[PDB]
Design a protein around this nucleic acid. Structure first.
Ligand SMILES: [Mg+2]
Ligand SMILES: [Mg+2]
Ligand SMILES: [Mg+2]
Ligand SMILES: [Mg+2]
Lengths: 63, 225, 136, 386
RNA sequence: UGAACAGCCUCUAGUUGAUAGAAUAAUGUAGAUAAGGGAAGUCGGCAAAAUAGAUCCGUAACUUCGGGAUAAGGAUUGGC
RNA sequence: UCUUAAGGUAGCCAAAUGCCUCGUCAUCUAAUUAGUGACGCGCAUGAAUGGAUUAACGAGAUUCCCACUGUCCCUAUCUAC
RNA sequence: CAGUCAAGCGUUCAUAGCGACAUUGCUUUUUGAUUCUUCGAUGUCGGCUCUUCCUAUCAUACCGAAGCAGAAUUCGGUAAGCGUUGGAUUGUUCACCCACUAAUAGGGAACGUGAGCUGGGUUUAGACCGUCGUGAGACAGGUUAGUUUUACCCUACUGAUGAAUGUUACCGCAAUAGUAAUUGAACUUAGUACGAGAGGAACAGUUCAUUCGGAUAAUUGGUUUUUGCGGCUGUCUGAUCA
RNA sequence: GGGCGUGUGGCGUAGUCGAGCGCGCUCCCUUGCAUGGGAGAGGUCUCCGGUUCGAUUCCGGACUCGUCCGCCA
């Protein structure tokens, strides 16, 4: 199997878990759950959502 | 020979197969006649690999191949990649491509020396083609057809292009590729010639509905005699 | 589907009933396709015949070129936008409903496809896979 | 006049009446057909339904488009402690059917099985099988005359077995007792096997093994009184309907001047005993083993229990059966797993199955992690961890 | 608060009256939400949804020249 | 030319007025006994029995389009009583 | 709707398929005829919903015949097990087109079904037009608007208890009753059999799908009084916190 | 749906079993408020079968058109 990464939060996606979304510019996004999927559809920036890997990498928290 | 073959009724052989000088690739869900054509014509000198690319029977439109290298999309699994690495000779290089257009047989029309690509490919993918295949690259369209792999059939000796192609585009592409090109049809008039057939230096395989003048044009332009 | 099927297809969750309007992905000059029928659909009282990805439908061009309007023609669904499950269990969906025009044998009226197509459609129709830019 | 448009009948008439089951343990109405050549073995087993999870396996179907490719499938887990054999019974065959003639019990009966014979256990002198154990502890006098009676008569031998409810996280303390048919050897060999196995435990791998197609017999989940729209699946009446719309409009013609039995009406939904056939065993797990949830490809030592335990059930410290798909009944319910009544080839019942990965994430939410070590490695250190 | 004797909350004053207790089946009455499609339902878009204040831009055919007109159609709005 | 008091003028129409009739042609739709525009030997239109036209207005009747939605595919769930 | 006879049609040949002139029947899903029951009232069109029955079988199963070479088709037998659709117009039944499908067969059950719905039509009282009438008014002529009541009783049906079989508990047997699965596509057989060619099968095998049914909730989606967490408006608790 | 009748040249129209006239225009001759005259072309008699010797004609079938009567309370 392959363990994919969340396109919004960077969480690990196990097989059969979450959803996938193909945008009209032929780019693939993978969501581990409906929470990150809905934040993506609400167009929030993952650099400003405090629990994401990209936020913690930006803010040097636990790095 | 332009060999008459069908893929279970399908007269498009370039979709389901990829033929180079050094190797051949065929789909796993194929008929005995379809395998027997490549086995009889190619012989034991050239390996024939039954493969699946990205879980799809279509392999010719998914992959772009050369005698020096093979390009596979990102969606190709590790089991398929390892099976191709074991089955293929050590000379060829297999490298995954991470690019949005992702259907390399449609995107890329290539031979041993020179290649035509889709105009809008990424620069890293162009450099990856030039590295792995060792092939000089041009970004060009065939009379406004961006899918140069589907709308051109190319070999070392010559090339077949789209029938509704401007003549000025024909000498421009011929001078750019350093091979003679003929506008013609395959499979009783189907426009998609690269999807219609596969060709290499000594063999061309086409659909059963490809007519005799079309087959004569094929053997004339590819010098298979 | 029916006649021009290259193999079989696993059941995809039906997302396009009769009366649905989808975008027309090819370069044939039509803008949208209006689904009036699904090939191979069964019969149940009050149930609408619905289409999924890779299905062949009967459609009319509601908006587009006048030589394409006001007649019925076959079409092939290439983008679904209703989420469906594969046998590797990913749930996936596009962001719009989209199809292309074809004859009853399945070869495309147009020549190029804009945007992605599904692999369940590209495996089933080789001409769509021939003119398709990206297959996911 | 005739019905204007034809449509199939709503519901199945062969599952009637849709009433509550007589007991919470469903009855095994038929056992596999005996042949007197195989060794003496049980025909079924008892367990408790624990819950469901997913696996990933490589499909082997030579001709499918998903041949030699990974698929993810839903399996359900049945917790099966080793069952305890107390008692055998023999059945003679009469022109009015099968009839039991004697029952010979084991000597020492545990408290969890003799709680089955009581409604008020806490106020009792616990006098059960006391004079029967007094019939024992002689040499043999009142014992092998009944055993030789079962040998001389009794064309069908069944074994009384009972679960070990105290090994499970259930708070019941009162075991389930059942009859399981023996399907090997002669009548004398059957009763000799039973006599040797009195007061002894039989494990689940002695009766089941991998890639075996089995049947699940259980009582379904109860739902109480239900209207006709969800109980039978009839069409909802339109919005502007006076006096309600979750109904059936015409419940019969003028003649015959009675409501027919075939008309869908409201009543009890669920809690019916069902037998679902052809479920393939993917794993016969051992409880005396770590890395139950590990495969040859995963190879991380984790048990089959998810993070936080199975929801509403608990732990799987005993042996278990991983079986493909859905079985009737909800969690914490007794379920009888039975061998197949026929030999199925089908090129699907003969498929050899080797698992690749088993899901052990939490079912009490959107679990991200399979093991607490993986969760700690991903999240780093926290405030509570010093 | 707000344009406002609108709606919502509060002060003075006045009530705390309307058989109650326990559970939460079906079918109701009243209030709601729904993936994908979007009137395919129906005699008929019945019912519901959508729109909504204010500022700026822009506004057709026709006309009894007064209108149509908030036509249509766009953009903005908090706190400091 | 006969008959009659005089023979339907200007206009309008399958109109809320046309039996035949689901009139014929065009348009609208994949498909229209619906709608609209024309045609007129009009069973049985027609001039203060008022005729024709008409801006604005209408809890009036009818057709189409955009938006919108559990009206529907196909049902599910929640709250109060 | 079905027979009998057979002058003829069918290149030739009554009966493969038809069949004139005649003649024997069946059915009560047509419309009549009659007036037996009901006028101290049996709710009156169509649709929606739902069950069952009939066979005079549209499809599916197995067969017989051909003016059956193959493919397609036609006639007939056992057969009602199983299915028989989505729409535009019209209040319609009916009809007529579009389209899918294996097929879109015909009917009954107080012209099934209004204390099941609806109320478009018809069929009150308002109103308009045309024709008729001096007039009041008339018109299976056209148009528009027009209150659809009650079950808590008995039976039936769906589910639920329960006295009495010395008491109580556990494990069982099985009389009887019900019953369920259905249809298609693709690959291959095979461009094979057959045929002069055009054309072009079938059995076995494999992978899927349609309709139906019984469960189930690992995953995905829906639902939110977990009023669980966060945010936001207005007001009130002097502010802050809450 | 059924009944009854109908079908001729480019147009209209005459036909007892043995396709003519008029109108359109082809040409020629002949004339302001533009005529007339003379020779022209023009049919598978709606179609298909039988009778006859030969059917526009008689008969049978089909197509087409025009009339008349027909659903419910
Ligand atoms: Mg309906
Ligand atoms: Mg009826
Ligand atoms: Mg019927
Ligand atoms: Mg859960």
């Amino acid at each position: 199997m392959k363990v994919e990464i969340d396109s919004f939060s960077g969480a690990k996606i196990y097989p059969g878990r979450g959803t996938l979304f193909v945008r009209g510019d032929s780019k693939i996004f993978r969501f581990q759950n409906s929470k990150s999927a809905s934040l993506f559809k609400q167009r929030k920036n993952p650099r400003r959502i405090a629990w994401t890997v990209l936020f913690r990498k930006h803010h040097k928290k636990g790095i | 020979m332009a060999t008459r073959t069908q893929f279970e009724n399908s007269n498009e052989i370039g979709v389901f197969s990829k033929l180079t000088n050094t190797y051949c690739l065929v789909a796993v869900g194929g008929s005995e006649n379809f395998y027997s054509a490549f086995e009889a014509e190619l012989g034991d000198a050239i390996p024939i690999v039954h493969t699946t690319i990205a879980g799809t029977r279509i392999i010719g439109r998914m992959t772009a191949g050369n005698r020096r290298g093979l390009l596979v999309p990102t969606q190709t699994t590790d089991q398929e990649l390892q099976h191709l690495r074991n089955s293929l000779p050590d000379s060829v290089k297999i490298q995954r491509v991470e690019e949005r257009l992702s259907a390399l047989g449609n995107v890329i029309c290539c031979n041993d020396y020179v290649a035509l690509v889709h105009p809008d490919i990424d620069r890293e993918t162009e450099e990856l083609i030039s590295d792995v295949l060792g092939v000089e690259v041009f970004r060009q369209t065939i009379s406004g057809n961006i899918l140069v792999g589907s709308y051109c059939s190319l070999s070392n000796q010559g090339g077949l292009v789209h029938p509704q192609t401007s003549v000025q585009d024909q000498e421009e592409l011929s001078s750019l590729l350093q091979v003679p090109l003929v506008a013609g049809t395959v499979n009783r008039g189907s426009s998609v010639v690269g999807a219609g057939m596969v060709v290499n230096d000594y063999l061309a395989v086409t659909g059963l509905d490809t007519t005799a003048p079309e087959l004569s044009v094929i053997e004339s332009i590819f010098r298979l005699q | 589907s029916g006649n021009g099927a290259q193999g079989t297809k696993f059941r995809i969750s039906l997302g396009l009933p009769v009366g649905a309007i989808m975008n027309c992905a090819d370069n044939s000059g039509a803008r949208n396709l209006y689904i009036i029928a699904v090939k191979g659909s069964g019969s149940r009282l009050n149930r609408l015949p619905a289409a999924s990805l890779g299905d062949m439908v009967m459609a009319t061009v509601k908006k587009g070129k006048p030589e394409l309007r006001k007649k019925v023609m076959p079409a092939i669904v290439v983008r679904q936008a209703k989420s469906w499950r594969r046998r590797d269990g990913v749930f996936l969906y596009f962001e719009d409903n989209a199809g292309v025009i074809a004859n009853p044998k399945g070869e495309m009226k147009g020549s190029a496809i804009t945007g992605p197509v599904g692999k369940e459609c590209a495996d089933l129709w080789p001409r769509v896979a021939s003119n398709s830019g990206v297959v996911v | 006049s005739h019905r204007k448009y034809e449509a199939p009948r709503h519901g199945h008439l062969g599952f009637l009446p849709r009433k509550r089951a007589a007991s919470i343990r469903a009855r095994v109405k038929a056992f596999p057909k005996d042949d007197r050549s195989k060794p003496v073995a049980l025909t079924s087993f008892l367990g408790y339904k624990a819950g469901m999870t997913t696996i990933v396996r490589d499909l082997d179907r030579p001709g499918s488009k998903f041949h030699k490719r990974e698929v993810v499938e839903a399996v359900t887990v049945v917790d099966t402690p080793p069952v305890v054999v107390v008692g055998v019974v023999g059945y003679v065959e009469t022109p009015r059917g099968l009839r039991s003639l004697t029952t010979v019990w084991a000597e020492h009966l545990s408290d969890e099985v003799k709680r089955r014979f009581y409604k008020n256990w806490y106020k009792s002198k616990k006098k059960a099988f006391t004079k029967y154990s007094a019939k024992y502890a002689q040499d043999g006098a009142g014992i092998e005359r009944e055993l030789a009676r079962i040998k001389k008569y009794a064309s069908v031998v069944r074994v009384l077995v009972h679960t070990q409810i105290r090994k499970t996280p259930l708070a019941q303390k009162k075991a389930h007792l059942a009859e399981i048919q023996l399907n090997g050897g002669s009548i004398s060999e059957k009763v000799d096997w039973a006599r040797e196995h009195f007061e002894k435990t039989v494990a689940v791998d002695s009766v089941f093994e991998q890639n075996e197609m089995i049947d699940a017999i259980a009582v379904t989940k109860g739902h109480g009184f239900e209207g006709v729209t969800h109980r039978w699946g009839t069409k909802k009446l339109p919005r502007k309907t006076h006096r309600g719309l979750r109904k059936v409009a015409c419940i019969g013609a003028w003649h015959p001047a009675h409501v027919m039995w075939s008309v869908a009406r409201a009543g009890q939904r669920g809690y019916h005993s069902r037998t679902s056939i052809n479920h393939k065993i993917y794993r016969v797990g051992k409880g005396d083993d770590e890395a139950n949830g590990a495969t040859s490809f995963d190879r991380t030592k984790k048990t089959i229990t998810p993070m936080g335990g199975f929801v509403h059930y608990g732990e799987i410290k005993n042996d278990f059966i991983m079986v493909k798909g859905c079985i009737p009944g909800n969690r914490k319910r007794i379920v009888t797993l039975r061998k197949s009544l026929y030999t199925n080839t089908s090129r699907k019942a003969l498929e050899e199955v080797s698992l690749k990965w088993i899901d052990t994430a939490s079912k009490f939410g959107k679990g991200r992690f399979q093991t607490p070590a993986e969760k700690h490695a991903f999240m780093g250190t926290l405030k509570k961890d010093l």
